[PDB]
Ligand binder design. Sequence first.
Ligand SMILES: COc1cccc(CNC(=O)c2ccc3c(c2)OCc2cnccc2-3)c1
Ligand SMILES: COc1cccc(CNC(=O)c2ccc3c(c2)OCc2cnccc2-3)c1
Ligand SMILES: [Cl-]
Lengths: 377, 376
Amino acid sequence: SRQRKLEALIRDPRSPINVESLLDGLNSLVLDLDFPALRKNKNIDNFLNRYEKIVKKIRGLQMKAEDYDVVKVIGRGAFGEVQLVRHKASQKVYAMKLLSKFEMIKRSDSAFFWEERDIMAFANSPWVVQLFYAFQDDRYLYMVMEYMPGGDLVNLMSNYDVPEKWAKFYTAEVVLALDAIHSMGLIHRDVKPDNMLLDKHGHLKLADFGTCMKMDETGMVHTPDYISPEVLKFYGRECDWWSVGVFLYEMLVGDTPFYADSLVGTYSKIMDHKNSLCFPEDAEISKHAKNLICAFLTDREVRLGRNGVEEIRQHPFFKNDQWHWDNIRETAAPVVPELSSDIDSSNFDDIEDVETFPIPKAFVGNQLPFIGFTYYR
Amino acid sequence: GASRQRKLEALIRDPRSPINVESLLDGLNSLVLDLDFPALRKNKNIDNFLNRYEKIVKKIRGLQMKAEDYDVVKVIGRGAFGEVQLVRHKASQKVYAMKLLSKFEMIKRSDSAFFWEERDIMAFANSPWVVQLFYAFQDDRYLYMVMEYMPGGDLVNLMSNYDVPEKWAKFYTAEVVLALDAIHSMGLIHRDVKPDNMLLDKHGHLKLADFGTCMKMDETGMVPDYISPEVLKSFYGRECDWWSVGVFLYEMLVGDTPFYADSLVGTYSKIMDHKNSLCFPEDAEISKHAKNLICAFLTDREVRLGRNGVEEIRQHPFFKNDQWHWDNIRETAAPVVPELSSDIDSSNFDDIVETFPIPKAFVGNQLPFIGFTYYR
Ligand SMILES: COc1cccc(CNC(=O)c2ccc3c(c2)OCc2cnccc2-3)c1
Ligand SMILES: COc1cccc(CNC(=O)c2ccc3c(c2)OCc2cnccc2-3)c1
Ligand SMILES: [Cl-]
């Protein structure tokens, strides 16, 4: 039936015409028309009068920023911040990412959040931070995610001298996490320890999917210290595997392989990786660890990971007496976080602390790029 | 928390709700229609939104009810903003009457709100006295209302083919009285009761149609040939519909309207002067009870029959008969039962476009029609 086919489209949570997206369309239409200049048009003024009471009722019922208490700012980004929040009714703690609609439109970057929201909402993977809710108001997009109290791998590296047994565990967990992202047809493009978070048990999850891109049928897609040579000079999955080599080097050596005083010096060192990569003589690194770093830090054509993840899995570096690839996330992590409460943000450094869209004379549609963002798990 | 999500889901499930799924799909369709113009697509916000919703909106347009699902058999009615066609649904092969309303003419002639009560009365009355609406759909040019076809025609047609005896006039007046009481009970005043809007079903029984003038009454009960004097001298009560019933009973029995004149102004002058202009011709075959009932309706609003409710009308001596009771009249044999040769026989009906300009900026011509779609 045509009515059955149409009702199936609205029930689908991945559908652009689900009830949440249809409510976004109505909310956005009201937001973009409720201006004194536009209200001079009888069509616009009468429509706003008809939908005024129901839209105000809907606004009070739907999820909003006022349903959460902001505890602390635990992160900052180009377009907003990440807050540690507590839901006022349920008393449950989450991490909430905010994205400024004004900054996203002004800096012509207003489409990256679709894949970010979808990866977190629909991955169903223990390696990806879960999104519970996605909602919005006139100024921001909000993403309510699981809070990772263990902090990131930048914080871990600065508080510990990482032994090779630990480095082996974290690299293996990054490998499985990137294999999960790659299996969903995506390339991360920003693999760095700042985006590798640890949960309450010390296990890894990836976060910040703002650079993720869906790869085409060929498996292709059209940060200075972690950027690969091919992006500096049309990239595939092995672009993410470069960053894993840089990460394993930073963990074992204590410094980045292509560190330099200037940004141009660092770029020059990455282009010259065939001669600029060298392990310090004091370095306490095994032959297998140097071999694995070197297999990742090569030109894209011969790089480890180009032919999937099976070649990475069988590398001799990963041989150990604690875990297997099928059970690594259910074994004891090297560092188990010592938390004093559900809002303990001691594994996060303190963050140091406004503009709106101009009132329009004619219809501009600033809310239109955000229709369909709302999602409730 | 979950109470908020329950309250919100109840609002969308409600078929009377302005935010039901049909209304939410109208909002998306209208937004796409009002933005898909080359001039507006210069704006990146508009162009990118239309690119995102292009495939899904085309899919929705093919699945949703459209004029192409019906075969037009004949035009059986005409009106200010459109026409009523006798149509056949292509898939089910079922016959309906479909009223069309031009969005362009309704906007141009600043009359774009009357259809809300009309659609609601027909969709939700659940009364044998009101024409039933099955579907309400719309495209870029028209609003459509798919209703049950009344093959018996209207009472204008009945009056021109028959010399109506008083026993028949009693039956049709009693059915109009019950039909009006049903509308009054729903909190509405018709304001245009006339035999053109009184239709007969396949069995010869009455149903009212054309609810374009209906208005919801306040807590106080307040809001040419058939209009009351108080309506002409312009707040109206339900007794302005009872005036129309007196005019109808007079036309049925006498053969002419009580305030007929060659011109519209002549008719208006006669209605204002009803105290002296109303007179029964000496050759009119009418009883004393029939004249008394017509006179009780054709008075000033203050003393008019039906002002204090329908009970006073029901107990009038004119309605005394040995054929029906008020509780069963619609289940007794009608005076004239239609003889139809097929499901598209329209023998009881006499035989019977400017578009919006392409805009340079957002005008929102589809906005007044959001929420019209309804599927029974
Ligand atoms: C482009 O505009 C922005 C705006 C705001 C932040 C970012 C980058 N930062 C992030 O995206 C980010 C950072 C930390 C977390 C996170 C995401 O989600 C999971 C999570 C759980 N527990 C603790 C922390 C996190 C980018
Ligand atoms: C103000 O713009 C318009 C536009 C079009 C028509 C009218 C007046 N006409 C009507 O509203 C109307 C309503 C229902 C029926 C009808 C006419 O005649 C035939 C018929 C047969 N079977 C069932 C129902 C009907 C007014
Ligand atoms: Cl009786």
